[PDB]
Design an enzyme around this catalytic site. Structure first.
Site, PDB file in Angstrom:
ATOM      1  N   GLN A 105       0.866  -1.216   0.000  1.00  0.00           N
ATOM      2  CA  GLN A 105       0.000   0.000   0.000  1.00  0.00           C
ATOM      3  C   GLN A 105       0.889   1.249   0.000  1.00  0.00           C
ATOM      4  OE1 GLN A 105      -2.654   0.754   3.364  1.00  0.00           O
ATOM      5  NE2 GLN A 105      -4.225   1.462   1.962  1.00  0.00           N
ATOM      6  N   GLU A 258      -6.234   6.421   6.177  1.00  0.00           N
ATOM      7  CA  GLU A 258      -7.309   5.525   5.668  1.00  0.00           C
ATOM      8  C   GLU A 258      -7.421   4.315   6.591  1.00  0.00           C
ATOM      9  OE1 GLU A 258      -6.520   2.317   3.851  1.00  0.00           O
ATOM     10  OE2 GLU A 258      -8.608   1.710   3.614  1.00  0.00           O
TER      11      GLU A 258
HETATM   12  C1  HEM Z   1      -8.644   0.318   3.451  1.00  0.00           C
HETATM   13  C2  HEM Z   1      -7.678  -0.133   2.366  1.00  0.00           C
HETATM   14  C3  HEM Z   1      -6.607  -0.978   2.533  1.00  0.00           C
HETATM   15  C4  HEM Z   1      -6.165  -1.775   3.695  1.00  0.00           C
HETATM   16  C5  HEM Z   1      -6.938  -2.040   4.772  1.00  0.00           C
HETATM   17  C6  HEM Z   1      -5.962  -1.081   1.185  1.00  0.00           C
HETATM   18  C7  HEM Z   1      -4.835  -1.854   0.924  1.00  0.00           C
HETATM   19  C8  HEM Z   1      -4.091  -1.826  -0.253  1.00  0.00           C
HETATM   20  C9  HEM Z   1      -2.940  -2.575  -0.541  1.00  0.00           C
HETATM   21  C10 HEM Z   1      -2.321  -3.532   0.423  1.00  0.00           C
HETATM   22  C11 HEM Z   1      -2.507  -2.248  -1.798  1.00  0.00           C
HETATM   23  C12 HEM Z   1      -1.377  -2.760  -2.601  1.00  0.00           C
HETATM   24  C13 HEM Z   1      -0.596  -3.793  -2.274  1.00  0.00           C
HETATM   25  C14 HEM Z   1      -3.430  -1.322  -2.281  1.00  0.00           C
HETATM   26  C15 HEM Z   1      -3.358  -0.747  -3.536  1.00  0.00           C
HETATM   27  C16 HEM Z   1      -4.283   0.177  -4.053  1.00  0.00           C
HETATM   28  N1  HEM Z   1      -5.432   0.558  -3.456  1.00  0.00           N
HETATM   29 FE1  HEM Z   1      -6.100  -0.014  -1.749  1.00  0.00          FE
HETATM   30  N2  HEM Z   1      -6.629  -0.294   0.314  1.00  0.00           N
HETATM   31  C17 HEM Z   1      -7.645   0.291   0.984  1.00  0.00           C
HETATM   32  C18 HEM Z   1      -8.581   1.165   0.436  1.00  0.00           C
HETATM   33  C19 HEM Z   1      -8.517   1.632  -0.853  1.00  0.00           C
HETATM   34  C20 HEM Z   1      -9.438   2.563  -1.398  1.00  0.00           C
HETATM   35  C21 HEM Z   1     -10.603   3.139  -0.663  1.00  0.00           C
HETATM   36  C22 HEM Z   1      -9.056   2.822  -2.669  1.00  0.00           C
HETATM   37  C23 HEM Z   1      -9.737   3.748  -3.674  1.00  0.00           C
HETATM   38  C24 HEM Z   1     -10.803   2.955  -4.454  1.00  0.00           C
HETATM   39  C25 HEM Z   1     -11.411   3.713  -5.638  1.00  0.00           C
HETATM   40  O1  HEM Z   1     -11.179   3.382  -6.814  1.00  0.00           O
HETATM   41  O2  HEM Z   1     -12.202   4.689  -5.550  1.00  0.00           O
HETATM   42  C26 HEM Z   1      -7.891   2.043  -2.902  1.00  0.00           C
HETATM   43  C27 HEM Z   1      -7.208   2.115  -4.063  1.00  0.00           C
HETATM   44  C28 HEM Z   1      -6.010   1.477  -4.301  1.00  0.00           C
HETATM   45  C29 HEM Z   1      -5.192   1.723  -5.544  1.00  0.00           C
HETATM   46  C30 HEM Z   1      -5.503   2.710  -6.665  1.00  0.00           C
HETATM   47  C31 HEM Z   1      -4.748   4.017  -6.289  1.00  0.00           C
HETATM   48  C32 HEM Z   1      -4.758   4.290  -4.789  1.00  0.00           C
HETATM   49  O3  HEM Z   1      -5.596   5.055  -4.208  1.00  0.00           O
HETATM   50  O4  HEM Z   1      -3.942   3.679  -4.051  1.00  0.00           O
HETATM   51  C33 HEM Z   1      -4.098   0.887  -5.361  1.00  0.00           C
HETATM   52  C34 HEM Z   1      -2.906   0.661  -6.251  1.00  0.00           C
HETATM   53  N3  HEM Z   1      -7.554   1.336  -1.781  1.00  0.00           N
HETATM   54  N4  HEM Z   1      -4.387  -1.099  -1.337  1.00  0.00           N
HETATM   55  K   LIG Z   2      -5.016   3.413  -1.507  1.00  0.00           K
END
Ligand code: HEM
Ligand SMILES: [K+]
Ligand SMILES: *[C@@H]1O[C@H](CO)[C@@H](O[C@@H]2O[C@H](CO)[C@@H](O)[C@H](O)[C@H]2NC(C)=O)[C@H](O)[C@H]1NC(C)=O
Ligand SMILES: *[C@@H]1O[C@H](CO)[C@@H](O)[C@H](O)[C@H]1NC(C)=O
Ligand SMILES: *[C@@H]1O[C@H](CO)[C@@H](O)[C@H](O)[C@H]1NC(C)=O
Ligand SMILES: *[C@@H]1O[C@H](CO)[C@@H](O)[C@H](O)[C@H]1NC(C)=O
Ligand SMILES: [Ca+2]
Ligand SMILES: [Cl-]
Ligand SMILES: [Zn+2]
Ligand SMILES: [Zn+2]
EC number: 1.11.1.7
Length: 595
Positions: A105, A258
């Site tokens: 993340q 977050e």
């Molecule tokens: C809460 C959220 C997390 C953990 C409890 C979580 C975790 C990850 C990991 C471990 C990632 C990569 C190894 C990762 C990548 C990307 N995320 Fe995600 N994430 C949580 C919450 C969200 C939310 C909310 C979003 C946005 C969703 C939308 O499209 O509206 C989200 C996105 C992404 C993303 C796209 C760009 C960014 O915002 O990071 C990843 C590459 N995550 N998350």
């Molecule tokens: K994210």
């Protein structure tokens, strides 16, 4: 397209072509094309956008219109049928710590951010989206399928706003909608420092000439620093416990609060910057605050690069690491450094690595007090559990000694994310990250599964039997075909994550190819890559080679026992060593006099 909610502030800078430091925006990295990789530009398109109308409407917008003569299945319906599961028993990754998930993340947030259209504050638009589930302009709501329990409890939809996009420019000739990356495409610790000059300043300590980052002045973690609070209201972090009323942190990245373990990693990284600045002031008392800030920022940047390429990517890419990221051959100014649209979906593999609970552990790595283990959903936008319930150490111990969730074809995304996600604008633990990811694929004009298989030189399944062979899974392939009718229509996020993992890796073939290619470009296309000659001296590179996450923890917590290999599964005490036995960063190669 159709300008409502477009564009970003791209500030024009004259490039200092001879600076030894990255800019904040990522401008001036590529000398021939100074904007390549900078923040607030279009995501690169590896394949052209695929929209319902060829311009801007996502597939699934118009009820009449098909994709290749088939209706696309509801995002929430794909999630219910395929992504959910009941039994958390035996779901855990037996050879990846929770740090594995968390580092993912962190790297993702450093590389890409596609912010939702700001329809504005004061919105009747937010009202017509959330309350009335009315599709139009930037409101592209996630409709509940028939029999959805959320129908009985929440309403007809989850609200969803379309991602930000480049404004149509004065030809105004017809082009496909292109989403914006709000952060620098370089692996450059932009999540700490900001991708925008104004925030970058505000985050710094400018009262002292010591090149420190600002720290919280209201709260301390047994003498160790917290991030400053974000004082912007209303605060989601205040909303989740109005008695405690602890605001979200203010970081180089909008998403830092977050969830509690992301906030933790942001805290560790900030502490390291101030530790680096203090040590460099001791070695070079004549260095000014700018010099100290830039040199610490430059080291922390390399730290993120080394951990990612040496420790993280090999255990993601497994057998494919060598094929996509061979030995470095020096900076190539013809390589595209920009993050691709498809990459921002490919890296969401990490959503299948998040488990249902988080633990606080004591100095013997034992359950910390009577509410040691908490459900993940109670920790979205949660800063009060850090400030008012034991600091970051107990959470960091859990990162080391607890496990990532394993991706499972029958157990994909924990209900904590699939039914109970909290969004910062909204009031309910009621959202579905899997449904949001699928909706977002369509929002971003993503070509389909077989499009990307072909891009990666992989076979393109056309029948049930072909898909069963690719997935090594009869029932998953059948559920997919019943929903999508053609594998051509399978949204890239579910299609890629459905594939069994490559040998020694945590992703399948299609995702290994998409991630591999992007990380190769992130290194080869970066003029400030830590291994590019003249970025660091040879002696400094010898020093840097010895960094580890275990050392970061030793240097920036009161934890005295850590594993040597922090990303694999580690059990206390057999796998833990005293901090005194762990290699340090030798900073003497940064010593600078005039004689
Ligand atoms: C809460 C959220 C997390 C953990 C409890 C979580 C975790 C990850 C990991 C471990 C990632 C990569 C190894 C990762 C990548 C990307 N995320 Fe995600 N994430 C949580 C919450 C969200 C939310 C909310 C979003 C946005 C969703 C939308 O499209 O509206 C989200 C996105 C992404 C993303 C796209 C760009 C960014 O915002 O990071 C990843 C590459 N995550 N998350
Ligand atoms: K994210
Ligand atoms: C900016 O840096 C200054 C100087 O290091 C910080 O000031 C001191 O803060 C520590 C911890 O609060 C105290 O123990 C010292 O007595 C303070 N010295 C001075 C010069 O006041 C200051 O807090 C930093 N500001 C921020 C917002 O981080
Ligand atoms: C865990 O993964 C690492 C990968 O580098 C490996 O060295 C270690 O032996 C693995 N342990 C297993 C598979 O149990
Ligand atoms: C809010 O925090 C207080 C301490 O500030 C704690 O006693 C209480 O359980 C928390 N409430 C919620 C809603 O989590
Ligand atoms: C550098 O980049 C271009 C495009 O990736 C490629 O054709 C070329 O082979 C590369 N050159 C070197 C010297 O690696
Ligand atoms: Ca970056
Ligand atoms: Cl793309
Ligand atoms: Zn302490
Ligand atoms: Zn709301």
């Amino acid at each position: 397209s159709w300008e409502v909610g477009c564009g970003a502030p791209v500030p024009l800078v004259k490039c200092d072509e001879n600076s030894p430091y990255r800019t904040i925006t990522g401008d001036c990295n590529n000398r021939r094309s100074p904007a390549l990789g900078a923040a607030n530009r279009a995501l690169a398109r590896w394949l052209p956008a695929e929209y319902e109308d060829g311009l801007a409407l996502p597939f699934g917008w118009t009820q009449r219109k098909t994709r290749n003569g088939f209706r696309v299945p509801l995002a929430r319906e794909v999630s219910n049928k395929i992504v959910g599961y009941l039994d958390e028993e035996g779901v855990l990754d037996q050879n990846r710590s929770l740090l594995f998930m968390q580092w993912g993340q962190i790297v993702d947030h450093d590389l890409d951010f596609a912010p939702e259209t700001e329809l504005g504050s004061n919105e009747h638009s937010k009202t017509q989206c959330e309350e009335y589930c009315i599709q139009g302009d930037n409101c592209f709501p996630i409709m509940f399928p028939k029999n959805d329990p959320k129908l009985k409890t929440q309403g007809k939809c989850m609200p969803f706003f379309r991602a930000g996009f480049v404004c149509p420019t004065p030809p105004y000739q017809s082009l496909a909608r292109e989403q914006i990356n709000a952060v620098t495409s370089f692996l450059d610790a932009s999540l700490v420092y900001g991708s925008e000059p104004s925030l970058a300043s505000r985050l710094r300590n400018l009262s002292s000439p010591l090149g420190l980052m600002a720290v919280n002045q209201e709260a301390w973690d047994h003498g160790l620093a917290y991030l400053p609070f974000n004082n912007k209201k209303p605060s989601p972090c205040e909303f989740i416990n109005t008695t405690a009323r602890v605001p979200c942190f203010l970081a180089g990245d909008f998403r830092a609060s977050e969830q509690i373990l992301l906030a933790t990693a942001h805290t560790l990284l900030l502490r390291e910057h101030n530790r680096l600045a203090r040590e460099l002031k001791k070695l070079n008392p004549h260095w000014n605050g700018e010099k100290l800030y830039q040199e610490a920022r430059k080291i922390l940047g390399a730290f993120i690069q080394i951990i990612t390429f040496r420790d993280y990517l090999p255990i993601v890419l497994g057998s494919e690491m060598q094929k996509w990221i061979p030995p470095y051959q020096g900076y190539n100014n013809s390589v595209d450094p920009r993050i691709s649209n498809v990459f921002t979906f490919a890296f969401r593999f990490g959503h299948m690595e998040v488990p249902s609970t988080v633990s606080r552990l004591d100095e013997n790595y034992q359950p910390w007090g009577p509410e040691a283990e908490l459900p993940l959903h109670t920790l979205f936008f949660n800063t009060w559990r850090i400030i008012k319930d034991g600091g970051i150490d107990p959470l960091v111990r859990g990162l080391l000694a607890k496990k990532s969730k394993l991706m499972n074809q029958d157990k994909m995304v924990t209900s904590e994310l699939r039914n109970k996600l909290f969004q910062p604008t909204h009031k309910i633990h009621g959202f579905d990250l899997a449904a949001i990811n699928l909706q977002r694929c369509r929002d971003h004009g993503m070509p389909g599964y077989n499009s990307w298989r072909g891009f990666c030189g992989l076979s393109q399944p056309k029948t049930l039997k072909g898909l069963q062979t690719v997935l090594k899974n009869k029932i998953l392939a059948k559920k997919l075909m019943d929903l999508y009718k053609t594998p051509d229509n399978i949204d890239i996020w579910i299609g890629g994550n459905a594939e069994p993992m490559v040998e020694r890796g945590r992703v399948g073939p299609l995702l290994a190819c998409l991630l591999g290619r992007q990380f190769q470009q992130i290194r080869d296309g970066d003029r400030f890559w830590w291994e590019n000659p003249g970025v660091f001296t040879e002696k400094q590179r010898d020093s840097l080679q010895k960094v580890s996450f275990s050392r970061l923890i030793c240097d920036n917590t009161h934890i005295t026992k850590v594993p040597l290999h922090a990303f694999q599964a580690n059990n206390y005490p057999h796998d833990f060593v005293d901090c005194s036995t762990v290699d340090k960063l030798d900073l003497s190669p940064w010593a600078s006099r005039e004689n």
